[PDB]
Amino acid sequence: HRFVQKVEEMVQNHMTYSLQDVGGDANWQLVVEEGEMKVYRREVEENGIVLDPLKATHAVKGVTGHEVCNYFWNVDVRNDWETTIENFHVVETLADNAIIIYQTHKRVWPASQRDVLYLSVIRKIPALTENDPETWIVCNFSVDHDSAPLNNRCVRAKINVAMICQTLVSPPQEISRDNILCKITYVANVNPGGWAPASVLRAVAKREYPKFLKRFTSYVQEKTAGKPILF
Ligand SMILES: CCCCCCCCCCCCC/C=C/[C@@H](O)[C@H](CO)NC(=O)CCCCCCCCCCCCCCC
């Protein structure tokens, strides 16, 4: 499909940069910590527009990276966990693992409602060596599409989001979900697409990202509990 090169560039950039430890960078601040979930943000505002890169890490017992990515990507289960949208639909299927999605978000007062149009791709990155972890990644990044032009009711946000998963399995005869731990890195780089009050945007991000990470990961645990493991 026409976006294959763009997908590869986006995936490679995440694998090169998004897994780099930000812990030693004074510009990256821990904003939320609960259990194994840590949420960090770098405050960035250019021409009044809040761009604050967000990075979270989590460690989720009893689920695999393949499972987590499947649930994050699969549009059929989207409304079971997502809480920030008014509607979404699939604009185009590019491949078995790549779709283009249009969605409108819930309005955050006092700003205009935001919409987004993004390619969502799920990819397995095989281990190259014995000690290299296998990675499952979902990348959601803005693309243009003639069937979803700009409209007069919403401001079009631009996003680059990834959910990046590596799975640790402890030696057991068969593997139990008690033996598996999914290490998650989630990154979100969002351009709100126009002015919005900085304090409001930052408060909403601080609330909504951990709320999502907790809700979504608990959902995957709930939906996979008692079921055969999909590695
Ligand atoms: C009632 C709350 C309404 C919030 C509306 C925020 C609109 C901001 C622009 C779009 C944000 C992109 C969210 C990414 C979505 C997809 O990758 C995916 C599937 O939907 N979900 C997540 O990654 C899970 C993402 C969950 C967290 C999203 C919260 C973002 C808040 C940002 C700060 C407020 C921005 C409002 C602009 C005026």
Swiss-Prot record:
Protein name according to UniProt: Ceramide transfer protein
Domain writeup: The START domain recognizes ceramides and diacylglycerol lipids, interacts with membranes, and mediates the intermembrane transfer of ceramides and diacylglycerol lipids. The PH domain targets the Golgi apparatus.
Disease field: Neurodevelopmental disorder with hypotonia, speech delay, and dysmorphic facies: An autosomal dominant disorder characterized by mild to profound developmental delay with hypotonia, delayed motor skills, impaired intellectual development, poor or absent speech, and behavioral abnormalities. Some patients are non-verbal and non-ambulatory. Additional features may include early feeding difficulties, poor overall growth, seizures, brain imaging abnormalities, and dysmorphic facial features.
Protein function: Shelters ceramides and diacylglycerol lipids inside its START domain and mediates the intracellular trafficking of ceramides and diacylglycerol lipids in a non-vesicular manner.
Disulfide bonds: none
PTM section of the record: Inactivated by hyperphosphorylation of serine residues by CSNK1G2/CK1 that triggers dissociation from the Golgi complex, thus down-regulating ER-to-Golgi transport of ceramide and sphingomyelin synthesis.
Expression (tissue specificity): Widely expressed.
SUBUNIT field: Interacts with VAPA and VAPB. Interaction with VAPB is less efficient than with VAPA. Interacts (via FFAT motif) with MOSPD2 (via MSP domain).
Residues annotated for an N-acylsphing-4-enine binding in this entry: E82, Q103, N140, Y186
Organism lineage: Eukaryota, Metazoa, Chordata, Craniata, Vertebrata
Domain of life: Eukaryota
Entire-sequence positions represented here: 365 to 624 of 624
Annotated ranges, domain START: 7-225
Cell compartment(s), UniProt: Cytoplasm; Golgi apparatus; Endoplasmic reticulum
Impact after mutating W195A: Abolishes ceramide transfer
